[PDB]
Every structure is written in structure tokens, then in C-alpha cells.
Amino acid sequence: AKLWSLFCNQEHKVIIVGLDNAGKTTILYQFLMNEVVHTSPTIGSNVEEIVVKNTHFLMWDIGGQESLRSSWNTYYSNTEFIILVVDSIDRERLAITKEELYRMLAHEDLRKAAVLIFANKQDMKGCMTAAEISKYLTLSSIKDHPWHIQSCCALTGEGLCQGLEWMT
């Protein structure tokens, strides 16, 4: 993507969060194509810091060990974008996604952040619609951050450029 190259050459800070198995790594791979590449969590956290040109991506699983949440606070200041990846077939765990999202948003350090929600795995038959996910997440209630929900399939990259377009 020319749009990805443009975005990353600019000076952005971006958080990508979601439960394990949401599709975070796959989404990033569709753009990164092994260039920059795969790096272990910063000591004392579960947070992967990946630098793409002038852009810093911070990636982590939410919904695991509760004591991990404190490790994230240092990372919040100056974040331009929060990318929330939601597995659209995981009806059973959407409640944890909701809980952690609103926990994260409560931080004054994230007041500047715009939130892109990727409704991922939209290829799967019988998945929740983006509208249902938006309803459950009560996104219409977020008035203090810009937000957008984007249906996607991380495997084919379908929807990913449109999500990125909303960001840029």
C-alpha cells in the first residue's frame, strides 16, 4: 500500500490491542510483509514495540493476566490511534473486549486517541455483524474520541485499507 508507506513515513504513535487470537498479528502482517518484523515484548510487559520508519506501533493482548494492565500506562501518552481488533465469531468473549476497552479509554493519557475498531473474521459464516458489535460495545456512546468500526478479514486483507483510510 502506498497509503501505508505514507502513514508510516509520518510520525505516528499507534496502539493495537485485542484479545489473543483476534487477528492482530495477521492484520499487521498484511501491511508489514516481513520488513520490520517480529520483536519480543518489552521486559516487564506483554507489549511488542515495532518501529515502521517514523511510526511506532505498540501491540498487546488484552483480557489475560489482570496485573499486566499497569505495564501499559507508560505507553499511553501521545498515542494518536487505538486499533481494537475484535474476533467477530467469538461471541463468548466479546464481554471481555468491552470491559478492557472502557478500562483503557478511562485513562486521561489516551484522551487524544482516535479509535479504529476492526470487526475481524467477517469471512466466517454466522459471525456477529459490525453493527451488532458496535451495539454491544456501545460505540455510539463514545463522544470524547473519534471512532470508526471497519469490517475486515485479516487473511485476505479485505477491509484493511478502508480502516487505514479512516485513520489518514
Ligand SMILES: Nc1nc2c(ncn2[C@@H]2O[C@H](COP(=O)(O)OP(=O)(O)O)[C@@H](O)[C@H]2O)c(=O)[nH]1
Ligand atoms: N477465518 C479467519 N481467521 C483469521 C482471520 N484473521 C486471523 N485469523 C486466524 O486467527 C488466528 C489468530 O490470528 P493472529 O493474527 O495470530 O491473532 P493475534 O493473537 O491477535 O495476534 C490465526 O490462526 C489466524 O490465521 C480472519 O479474518 N478470518
